[PDB]
Design a protein around this ligand. Structure first.
Ligand SMILES: CC(C)Nc1nc2ccccc2[nH]1
Lengths: 156, 39
């Protein structure tokens, strides 16, 4: 199927009509998404099949066709852009200054932008266009609003 | 059955819409990959 670098919607025909369950990144012939989007199932790209290659429920990440390729990191200072791909809507860049998730194992950047759950897997970018992580695994705060981690994998 | 469809190129947009706050939150990550707020 299509292997050109870029952002892709992840769809299913299982429920009513065609439903967007998430989003992902194609880079260097490897498709990258969050685990909760596909649950590790195989994907179709036209008449081609993408098989899972690596995954981890705790990191909430999965790669198809090859190992995880994305290794850029948020510098901890600068604004970033969420390249939001919402269901039934055009891809749109939103610039924001990340907050931080503090954990017993270290700190991680977080973006406070709320989109439908089917937007999970949209990439977050730095100023050179590099993917520093994927949006869609996070928490609900007092006001009921959503805050996502900037979730990044490790390039082996 | 799940399938993928191209949605765009990955680029930084000059003068994109600028929004969102920058909260500092204490969180925990469990074995199931779920984040929870710690207070
Ligand atoms: C506060 C809730 C209803 N909003 C919400 N939950 C999400 C989960 C994953 C990605 C985006 C999401 N937006």
């Amino acid at each position: 199927g299509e292997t050109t670098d870029g952002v892709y919607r992840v769809m299913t025909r299982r429920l009513l009509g065609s439903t967007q369950v998430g989003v992902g990144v194609m880079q260097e012939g490897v498709f990258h998404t969050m685990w909760h989007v596909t649950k590790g199932a195989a994907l179709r790209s036209g008449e081609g099949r993408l098989d899972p290659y690596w995954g981890d429920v705790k990191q909430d990440l999965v790669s198809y066709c090859g190992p995880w390729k994305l290794d850029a990191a948020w510098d901890g200072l600068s604004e970033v852009q969420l390249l939001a791909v919402p269901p039934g809507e055009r891809a749109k860049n939103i610039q924001t200054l990340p907050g931080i998730f503090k954990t017993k194992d270290g700190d991680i950047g977080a973006v406070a932008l709320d989109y439908p759950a089917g937007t999970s897997g949209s990439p977050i970018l730095d100023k050179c266009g590099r993917v520093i992580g994927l949006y869609g695994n996070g928490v609900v705060i007092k006001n009921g609003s959503y805050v996502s981690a900037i979730t990044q994998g490790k390039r082996e | 059955d799940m399938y993928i469809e191209r949605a765009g190129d990955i680029t930084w947009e000059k003068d994109a819409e600028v929004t969102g706050n920058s909260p500092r939150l204490d969180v925990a990550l469990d074995e199931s990959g779920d984040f929870s707020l710690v207070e």
